[PDB]
């Protein structure tokens, strides 16, 4: 449908986000 990140809301899911440092 529509791809939207959950960390920066760019152009890529939350998995392929260039800032998935939210792993901890
Ligand atoms: Zn992102």
Curated annotation (Swiss-Prot):
It comes from the Eukaryota. It is found in: Cytoplasm; Nucleus; Cytoplasm, Perinuclear region. Phosphorylated. Phosphorylation is enhanced upon serum stimulation. Belongs to the eIF-3 subunit G family. RNA-binding component of the eukaryotic translation initiation factor 3 (eIF-3) complex, which is required for several steps in the initiation of protein synthesis. The eIF-3 complex associates with the 40S ribosome and facilitates the recruitment of eIF-1, eIF-1A, eIF-2:GTP:methionyl-tRNAi and eIF-5 to form the 43S pre-initiation complex (43S PIC). The eIF-3 complex stimulates mRNA recruitment to the 43S PIC and scanning of the mRNA for AUG recognition. Component of the eukaryotic translation initiation factor 3 (eIF-3) complex, which is composed of 13 subunits: EIF3A, EIF3B, EIF3C, EIF3D, EIF3E, EIF3F, EIF3G, EIF3H, EIF3I, EIF3J, EIF3K, EIF3L and EIF3M. The eIF-3 complex appears to include 3 stable modules: module A is composed of EIF3A, EIF3B, EIF3G and EIF3I; module B is composed of EIF3F, EIF3H, and EIF3M; and module C is composed of EIF3C, EIF3D, EIF3E, EIF3K and EIF3L. EIF3C of module C binds EIF3B of module A and EIF3H of module B, thereby linking the three modules. EIF3J is a labile subunit that binds to the eIF-3 complex via EIF3B. This is Eukaryotic translation initiation factor 3 subunit G. It comes from Homo sapiens. The chain holds residues 153 to 176 of 320 of the full protein.
